[PDB]
């Protein structure tokens, strides 16, 4: 009996209130309505993390595939560790929330070939060996480029990303971004024959990762470009590139913790990774999510204060209940108070329709009182 039938209609209006800004915003209403589109994006994270409950988990267990050494256990080691997959569910939710701009650049390195003796050099890679023989205009047309790719990779539009990094004749680049999308080899693996139909992956990605990271820390090349590489490996994007942080410092610092356990996992099984394949060192960070939302809290310009962002914080930690009980304490005191902000109490009825529905894990007193006081103080 999905309770979200009412919520879905809050989330619906929340989103349609995002569209009243485009027309004639430009006053306090473009700002206050940045709160509405934040609610909606919260009702979604809520709508889909709760959904996460028992669902034919038994026959899911794939057991005729282990020992495979197929190096593609993502399908399994993201199905057995329900914790990590939960992380992921958040990421995909964050990805559908990134911005995506578009700006007017083809024929790759144009003005540098025509003029520069870079003809002997010829290729990007073979260039870093010469330091400062990148000419002007080119070094900029390439810059805007990796600003469009970093922005678009963040959003997880990988597909549409390579379709553009090709249109600029920057194919050598595009190639690299194929180790990230595939990041492992699916071939004649039984349980998966219904999807791929052909061998479409790249072995030794655990080895390739430590390569692209060696690329991100060389620093000789573009700031943004240098940044997109690190993402695909780990979360140390160049600080000169960390200016922007919607909640992307979230999306990334998490990818850190995920593609790490992922690595330390296929390592634990000795199934996909050779010992001599690890060229560059990489630490196994136990970045517990509860500690990651905290180190990210110092990069929250009061972005961890907002009503809605305190809530997305608990929804992530499953400590949503203690939040509703720590809140009632205030509504009993009446002694200022965030529950006098027009937006927070519509979310107290969130905790009113879920708790009883999902587990019935919330007191009938803590509930009952905040049903009353709400329907009481309305305008």
């Amino acid at each position: 009996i999905d309770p979200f039938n009412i919520i879905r209609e809050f989330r619906s209006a929340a989103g349609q209130l995002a569209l009243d800004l485009a027309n004639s915003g430009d006053e306090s209403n473009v700002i206050s309505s940045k709160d509405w589109e934040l609610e909606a994006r919260f009702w979604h994270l809520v709508e889909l993390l709760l959904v996460f409950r028992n669902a034919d988990l038994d026959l899911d267990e794939m057991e005729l595939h282990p020992y495979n050494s197929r190096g593609l256990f993502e399908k399994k080691l993201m199905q057995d560790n329900k914790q990590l997959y939960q992380i992921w569910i958040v990421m995909v939710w964050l990805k559908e929330n990134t911005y995506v701009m578009e700006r007017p650049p083809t024929s790759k390195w144009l003005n540098s070939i025509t003029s520069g003796g870079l003809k002997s050099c010829d290729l990007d890679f073979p260039l870093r060996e010469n330091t400062n023989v990148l000419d002007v205009k080119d070094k900029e047309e390439d810059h805007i480029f990796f600003k469009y790719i970093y922005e678009l990779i963040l959003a997880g539009a990988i597909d549409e990303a390579l379709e553009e990094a090709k249109l600029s004749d920057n194919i050598s680049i595009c190639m690299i971004l194929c180790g990230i999308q595939e990041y492992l080899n699916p071939v004649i693996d039984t349980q998966i024959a219904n999807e791929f139909n052909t061998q479409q992956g790249i072995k030794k990605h655990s080895l390739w990762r430590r390569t692209v990271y060696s690329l991100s820390q060389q620093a000789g090349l573009d700031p943004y470009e240098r940044a997109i590489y690190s993402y695909l490996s780990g979360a140390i994007p160049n600080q000169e590139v960390l200016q922007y942080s919607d909640w992307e410092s979230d999306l990334h610092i998490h990818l850190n913790q995920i593609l790490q356990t992922e690595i330390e996992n296929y390592l634990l099984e000795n199934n996909q990774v050779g010992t001599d394949e690890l060229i560059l060192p990489l630490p196994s960070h136990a970045l517990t999510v509860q500690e990651v939302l905290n180190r990210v809290a110092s990069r929250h310009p009061s972005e961890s204060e907002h009503p809605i962002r305190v809530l997305m914080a608990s929804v992530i930690l499953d400590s949503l209940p203690s939040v509703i009980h720590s809140s009632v304490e205030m509504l009993l005191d009446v002694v200022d108070k965030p529950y006098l902000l027009r937006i927070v109490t519509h979310l107290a009825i969130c905790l009113d329709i879920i708790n009883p529905g999902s587990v019935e894990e919330v007191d009938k007193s803590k509930l009952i009182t905040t049903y009353i006081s709400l329907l009481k103080l309305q305008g």
């Binding site: 005729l64 020992y67 790759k108 070939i113 003809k119 002997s120 010829d122 290729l123 990007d124 890679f125 073979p126 260039l127 870093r128 060996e129 090709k166 004749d169 194919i171 050598s172 595009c174 190639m175 690299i176 194929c178 180790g179 595939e182 080899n185 071939v187 004649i188 039984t190 052909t198 061998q199 479409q200 992956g201 790249i202 072995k203 030794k204 990605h205 080895l207 390739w208 390569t211 692209v212 060696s214 690329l215 060389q218 090349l221 001599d276 394949e277 060229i279």
Partner: protein, 701 residues
């Protein structure tokens, strides 16, 4: 001058020699090693003694000799004492050839003369005697020989005459004599000698030596078919040839020329013969002259021991008993422990047309013959490779599907091959990495070692990063990457860009096809071994799309290969699966690069593992060769074992029987718990021979 003779003959065991020179005398010798013991001289004759020959040692110690006095004599040894026991002189001219028919025909002798007649005389002290005679030739009969036994109807013998012809006869019941069956007009002068082939294969063989210096070999499959004529070589010999003798095993043809030298000959898959191991007064004048006989009279008849006798002066009787030139050379063969543990890998069963044992089940892999060698001798390379290509890989832990057990086997064998191309190409590339002041070229080379690891690691130390990442996209045959490579390069052309030569090549290894691309790599023929070029299309080529066999082939279609390379040829087999047998004959027809022992172990291990298609006819051919090789080397044990792998039952019997009868005291308990018994050799065969030799050593001691 010095001791000069005309003919000589060893017996069934080769411990008794005989010589007959123009001194009208014979000389019987007791041969024991490199020594020659004279027993007695024979004074019987009135003219130059031409030839001699022993009769089967189941009739006693007998010797026949003919001379210019047209009188054939029969000598016998009684408790040591030599004595003329009979006489046969029914010819008006001089007698020439004397040979005892196979023992199955009883004590029977053949005799040819210059009067143009041939006679067959039956000697039995108790039994009845009935002589025969035939007008064979026009100007005379120089020689005649008995055909191998097969009902007295299948008795045939070939004759040669100074009328330039080679006639064949057959014992007819009706006529009470030998009627004419075939004439063969292939010479243009005096036929000096004709010998029938003791071989047992479906085809019969005949060798006719001429005075016009030619030599024809006649073959026949069917029993009433046409005798196919075939010159030994399209050009005529130096001098005039005299003798023509076959080896009891292997179908070898020793030939005695007028250039005082003897020249051996063997056959091929073609039928055209390639040469085997080379080795080396008063009233008497007219006699020699009416015999159109020169002063250069050499001779060479094979012995029961498949050994070759030839006149020299190195010996107390100018008769060397050299051992055949065993071209085949392998160290581990001479070992008894190899034979022993090699039999066990077999399940021996007797055939359905005779008790004679023949292999039914074989688990012989190439791996086996690797422990008995060194990891250095050139062979180990030739062998271990075959052991990785054609040897049926096995996967320890079974798996859900039969396709999965396949692709895994497809893979494990793939890695063995490439991990070997490394071991060999090793020194070639390793030394080509010293000569380099181009760190990037140091990469492309390190990639020919299938070492992406130390390759990409280097790419970074090269101060350039990107390629280091693309190097890691190597082993896997991702399609979208093979696509991009070709797209990146096509956008190099239009750009008029100048990419470092060895960096665009690394890029060409991603397009899954480097030797045919836009930026092709065929150029690399110049400095890089053909093998190494192959190693590329094997590691970075389209592993998954094609079949490991097919793929290896799609590289040959790009290059010719060392026309005379053992390892190089091996691949060419692996290459064409459906026509592997068609190409094996196509190979040996052009190059003696695969060992005689190899051709067998190769076609035999492949036929007992269900790897490829093999004609019995062919299998036998290379089994004959190898069976003889060991035999010439005197290893009758291992020789016997190989003979087992014979598919023609009528052939095996003759090969096995004869090999055992002659060499029994060497095939006894003293060697590995009765080797002959562990092979399922007929009980009656042993007993027939055991007491045969005992009959001999009695008369001798």
């Amino acid at each position: 001058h010095n001791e000069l003779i005309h003919d000589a003959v060893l017996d069934y065991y080769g411990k008794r020699l005989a010589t007959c020179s123009s001194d009208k005398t014979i000389k019987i010798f007791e041969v024991e090693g490199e020594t020659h013991k004279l027993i007695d001289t024979l004074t019987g004759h009135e003219g130059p003694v031409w030839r001699v020959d022993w009769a089967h040692p189941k009739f006693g110690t007998i010797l026949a000799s003919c001379s210019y006095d047209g009188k054939v004599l029969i000598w016998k040894e009684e408790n040591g004492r030599w004595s003329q026991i009979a006489v046969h002189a029914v010819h008006s001219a001089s007698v020439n050839s004397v040979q005892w028919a196979p023992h199955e025909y009883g004590p029977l002798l053949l005799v040819a003369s210059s009067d143009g007649k041939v006679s067959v005389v039956e000697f039995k002290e108790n039994g009845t005697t009935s002589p025969i005679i035939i007008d064979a030739h026009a100007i005379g009969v120089n020689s005649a020989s008995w055909a191998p036994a097969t009902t007295k109807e299948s008795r045939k013998f070939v004759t040669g005459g100074a009328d330039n012809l080679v006639k064949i006869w057959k014992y007819n019941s009706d006529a009470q004599t030998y009627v004419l069956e075939s004439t063969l007009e292939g010479h243009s002068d005096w036929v000096r000698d004709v010998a029938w082939s003791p071989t047992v294969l479906l085809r019969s063989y005949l060798a006719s030596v001429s005075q016009d210096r030619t030599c024809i070999i006649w073959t026949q499959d069917n029993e009433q078919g046409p005798w196919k004529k075939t010159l030994l070589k399209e050009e005529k010999f130096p001098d005039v040839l005299w003798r023509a003798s076959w080896s009891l095993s292997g179908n070898v043809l020793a030939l005695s020329g007028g250039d005082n030298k003897v020249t051996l000959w063997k056959e091929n898959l073609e039928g055209k013969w390639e040469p085997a191991g080379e080795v080396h007064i008063d009233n008497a004048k007219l006699i020699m002259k009416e015999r159109r006989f020169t002063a250069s009279y050499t001779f060479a008849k094979f012995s029961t021991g498949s050994m070759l006798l030839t006149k020299d002066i190195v010996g107390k009787s100018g008769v060397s008993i050299k051992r055949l030139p065993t071209e085949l050379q392998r160290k581990f063969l001479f070992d008894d422990v190899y034979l022993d543990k090699e039999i066990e890998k077999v399940t021996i069963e007797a055939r359905k047309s005779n008790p004679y044992p023949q292999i039914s089940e074989s688990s012989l892999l190439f791996k086996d013959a690797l422990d008995y060698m060194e990891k250095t001798s050139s062979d180990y390379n030739l062998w271990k490779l075959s052991s990785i290509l054609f040897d049926p890989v096995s996967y320890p832990y079974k798996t859900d599907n039969d396709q999965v057990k396949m692709a895994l086997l497809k893979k494990e064998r793939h890695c063995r091959l490439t991990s070997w191309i490394v071991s060999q190409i090793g020194p070639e590339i390793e030394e080509k990495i010293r000569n380099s002041s181009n760190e990037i070229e140091q990469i492309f080379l390190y990639l020919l070692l299938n070492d992406v690891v130390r390759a990409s690691k280097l790419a970074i130390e090269s101060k350039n990063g990107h390629l280091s990442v693309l190097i890691s996209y190597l082993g896997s045959n991702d399609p979208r990457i093979r696509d991009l490579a070709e797209l990146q390069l096509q956008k190099w052309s239009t750009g008029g860009c100048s990419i470092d030569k060895n960096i665009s090549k690394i890029y060409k290894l991603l397009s899954g096809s480097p030797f045919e691309g836009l930026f092709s790599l065929k150029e690399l023929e110049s400095e890089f071994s053909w093998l190494c070029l192959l190693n590329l299309t094997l590691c970075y080529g389209q592993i998954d799309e094609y079949s490991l066999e097919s793929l290896v082939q799609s590289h040959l279609d790009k290059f010719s290969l060392p026309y005379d390379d053992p390892i190089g040829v091996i691949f060419q087999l692996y290459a064409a699966n459906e026509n592997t047998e068609k190409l094996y004959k196509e190979v040996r027809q052009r190059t003696n690069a695969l060992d005689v022992q190899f051709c067998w172990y190769l076609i035999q291990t492949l036929r007992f593992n269900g790897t490829r298609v093999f004609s019995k006819e062919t299998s036998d051919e290379a089994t004959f060769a190898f069976a003889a090789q060991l035999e010439f080397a005197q290893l009758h044990g291992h020789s016997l074992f190989v003979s087992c792998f014979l598919n023609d039952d009528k052939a095996a019997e003759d090969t096995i029987k004869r090999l055992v009868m002659r060499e029994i005291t060497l095939l006894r308990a003293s060697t590995n718990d009765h080797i002959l018994n562990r092979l399922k050799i007929p009980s009656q065969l042993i007993f027939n021979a055991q007491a045969l030799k005992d009959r001999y050593e009695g008369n001798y001691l």
